[PDB]
Design a protein around this ligand. Structure first.
Ligand SMILES: CN1Cc2ccccc2NC1=O
Length: 120
């Protein structure tokens, strides 16, 4: 529905489903195993992954698509910080998937901002 301040929830659930089904999301689908990778927390202050984002959305624990978008962007900025080399296939996967995410989220954000303006 036009001007729906709830539309983002279904739009983000659908977008997360597309990301999970994309091969480029494979490294980012679950929390980094901090026992397997003991220097991860030396580099990364705030781990994030797509299963955490999907679970938080399904629980109703995001107030706005901005809060969801901040967590997704943290998945990609964490990957850049831990895996900074342009040579890494993991760097390439996060670049491709981040660009996909940013192309799809822009209209979710602008629709929300318009709905919120309407609601006020
Ligand atoms: C999500 N990760 C975790 C990881 C584990 C092992 C090797 C590289 C990476 N890089 C990432 O960006």
């Amino acid at each position: 529905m036009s001007y729906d301040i709830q539309a983002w929830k279904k739009q983000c659930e659908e977008l997360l489903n597309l990301i999970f089904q994309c091969e480029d999301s494979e490294p980012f689908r679950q929390p980094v195993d901090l026992l397997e990778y003991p220097d991860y927390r030396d580099i990364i202050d705030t781990p994030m992954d797509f299963a955490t984002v999907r679970e938080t959305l399904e629980a109703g624990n995001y107030e706005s698509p901005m809060e969801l978008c901040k967590d997704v962007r943290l998945i990609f900025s964490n990957s850049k910080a831990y895996t900074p080399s342009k040579r890494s296939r993991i760097y390439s996967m996060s670049l491709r998937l981040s660009a996909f995410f940013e192309e799809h989220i822009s209209s979710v954000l602008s629709d929300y901002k318009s709905a919120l303006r309407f609601h006020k």
